[PDB]
Amino acid sequence: YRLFRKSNLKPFERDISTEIYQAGSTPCNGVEGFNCYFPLQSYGFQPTNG
Amino acid sequence: QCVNLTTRTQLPPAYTNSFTRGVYYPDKVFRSSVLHSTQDLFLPFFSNVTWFHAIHVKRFDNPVLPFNDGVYFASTEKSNIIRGWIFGTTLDSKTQSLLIVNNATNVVIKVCEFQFCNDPFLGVYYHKNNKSWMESEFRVYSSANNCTFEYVSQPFLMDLEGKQGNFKNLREFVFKNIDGYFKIYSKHTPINLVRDLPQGFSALEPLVDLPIGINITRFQTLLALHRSYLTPGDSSSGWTAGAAAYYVGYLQPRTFLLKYNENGTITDAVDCALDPLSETKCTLKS
Amino acid sequence: LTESNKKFLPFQQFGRDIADTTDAVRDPQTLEILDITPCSFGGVSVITP
Ligand SMILES: C=CC1=C(C)/C(=C/c2[nH]c(/C=C3N=C(/C=C4\NC(=O)C(C)=C4C=C)C(C)=C\3CCC(=O)O)c(CCC(=O)O)c2C)NC1=O
Ligand SMILES: *[C@@H]1O[C@H](CO)[C@@H](O[C@@H]2O[C@H](CO)[C@@H](O)[C@H](O)[C@H]2NC(C)=O)[C@H](O)[C@H]1NC(C)=O
Ligand SMILES: *[C@@H]1O[C@H](CO)[C@@H](O)[C@H](O)[C@H]1NC(C)=O
Ligand SMILES: *[C@@H]1O[C@H](CO)[C@@H](O)[C@H](O)[C@H]1NC(C)=O
Ligand SMILES: *[C@@H]1O[C@H](CO)[C@@H](O)[C@H](O)[C@H]1NC(C)=O
């Protein structure tokens, strides 16, 4: 799932992109670092989970 | 395999007046002998539309244009030079981009993360040995991955051969993206008109409802090239272009009064709020 | 349900009047157009001493 996006989606809009999300004021030149997160995160589904 | 185009003579953008154009059937309900008031994204009447002209006399123009809340597209043809459209936001493999191409043997619609060239084009080759043409250069994209939607029509063929004289076919389209549905309306009509948009009224029928989910802000057209022995040089200069033309307008949220005749064909329309007289006509539903 | 002369386009399934009620339908089994005319009609007056 996507955790960071510059803006909300439109209805039935798909945004498969994987560019680095600039949380901070500084460009990140598509690298991972402070205030430069990856937008894609995943779930850890476990059979023992709530 | 792409190649930039170099022998270009630049001009200011031409403009013409859209004379009662941009009307499509707002829905799929049959009505007849009725004046129906509907509000939708229509091309304003008598509006100004940008005119690009592919000609060699070499002047051809396939810029990237904004997709402002839907686009009215029209073209005048004699040799099927305009064969497709590219829609997206960055057109550089970072996002998904809709590609519609008619490559003479298959209408292909794809939504994919295309890496597009700086100047997408197709190309047809003169054969001096026999009086027959064929399509031999396919260059719109360099790569394609994370491809999502794809459609290919039936196989076919069409006369891509060079004609001369006056243009014969007016092909009007409406392109809108509503809640993830890329809706294409179109109308084909025969003409005998050489320079500007014909004056008249013709309603655009739905054609589709492509579920793409693409955030579309810009688009580009796709023009084919004539390459011949009469055109010397490399791939970047060794070409000519057939004569044709296209017009680009933009849709706005407007109320129209639409006239359905006894056969259910829309024969006229009033753009409400065009001017005080149109407002009066709208008020009286006549 | 009666026969009709309304030439529906391939994408049209129903016709409507200005009041938005259904006028005609395309039969899904046989691609013919049928008009829908409400049965009840006319007025009744009662004369009584
Ligand atoms: C590009 C996407 C594209 C669309 C949306 C499209 C729609 C379209 N074009 C058609 C006819 C046709 N369409 C074309 C060619 C074109 N007409 C155009 O609007 C354009 C841009 C071309 C390409 C140059 C021709 C030559 C015919 C047949 C005309 C004839 O009867 O001779 C038809 C009728 C098919 C039938 O007979 O059942 C459809 C649905 N064709 C396409 O290629
Ligand atoms: C659809 O794409 C457009 C263009 O990429 C997005 O608008 C841009 O949003 C960024 C946000 O930082 C701005 O900096 C740009 O100036 C905007 N450009 C334009 C032309 O508006 C738009 O937000 C996208 N829509 C969605 C839902 O993602
Ligand atoms: C828009 O159309 C009008 C026609 O009345 C024209 O004068 C004007 O120049 C057009 N817009 C531009 C930017 O040229
Ligand atoms: C409606 O269709 C019929 C075909 O039976 C045709 O004769 C008539 O002229 C059409 N009406 C209009 C206004 O075109
Ligand atoms: C069954 O479907 C076909 C369409 O393929 C139609 O022609 C036929 O009339 C249908 N059956 C009946 C009983 O109408």
**Do the chains contact at C16 and B31, CB–CB below 8 Å?**
yes
Spatial separation of the C-alpha atoms in residues B61 and B8, rounded to whole Å: 9
- Selection from C27, C31, C19 nearest residue C1 by Cα: C27
Q: Which ligand is closest in space to the CA of residue B90?
A: 2
Who among C6, C7, C11 is closest to B28 (CB)? C11
> Across the interface, do A17 and B95 touch by the CB < 8 Å criterion?
yes
The fold of the B14-286 domain, in CATH, is Jelly Rolls (2.60.120)
Please give the Cα distance from B3 to B6 (Å, whole number).
Answer: 9
What determination technique applies here? Answer: cryo-EM
- Report resolution (Å) to 1 decimal: 3.1
Mutate to test the interface with B, among C4, C5, C14, C16 (most CBs of B within 10 A): C16
**Residues near ligand 1 with C-beta < 6 Å?**
B 80, 82-84, 100, 102, 107, 158, 171, 186, 207
Pocket test for ligand 3, best of B16, B48, B197, B247 (most atoms within 8 A of CB): B48
Question: What's the 3-state SS for chain B?
Answer: CCCCCCCCCCCCCEEEEECCCCCECCCCCECCCEEEEEEEEECCCCEEEEEEEEECCCECCCCEEECCCCEEEEEEECCCCEEEEEEECCCECCCCEEEEEECCCCEEEEEECCEEEEEEEEEEECCCCCCCCEEEEEEEEEECCCCCEEEECCCCCCCCCCCCCCEEEEEEEEEEEECCEEEEEEEEEEEEECCCCCCCCCCEEECCEEECCCCCCEEEEEEEEEECCCCCCCCCCCCECCCEEEEEEECEEEEEEEEECCCCCEEEEEECCCCHHHHHHHHHCC
Taking the C-alpha atoms of residue B178 and residue B40, their distance in angstroms, rounded to an integer, is 11
Q: What is the Cα–Cα distance from B118 to C32, expressed in whole angstroms?
A: 52
Q: Pick from B32, B34, B206: which is nearest to C11 by CB? A: B206
Are B47 and B23 within 8 A, CB to CB? no
Closest CA to A22 of A45, A6, A46, A3: A6
B241 and B54 Cβ atoms separated by less than 8 Å: yes
Distance B107 CA to ligand 1 centre (A): 8
Q: How far is the CA of B186 from the centre of ligand 1 (A)?
A: 10
Residues of A in contact with B179 (CB under 8 A): 10-12
Residues near B210 by Cβ (< 8 Å), separated by ≥ 6? B98, B109, B111, B149, B151, B181, B182, B183, B184
Q: Phi, psi (5° rounding) for residue B127?
A: -115, 115
**Is there a contact between B32 and B264 (Cβ–Cβ < 8 Å)?**
yes
Instruction: Find all residues with CB under 8 Å of B207, minimum gap 6, and list them.
Output: B184, B185, B186
By Cβ distance, the residue of A13, A16, A19 closest to B180 is A13
- Residue B265's CB is within 10 A of a number of other CB atoms, namely 14
Rounded Cα distance, A18 and B33, in Å:
53
Q: Rounded to whole angstroms, what are the CA distances from B157 to B103, B105, B160?
A: 9, 5, 9
Scanning B206-265 for CB atoms below 8 A from A yields: 211-215
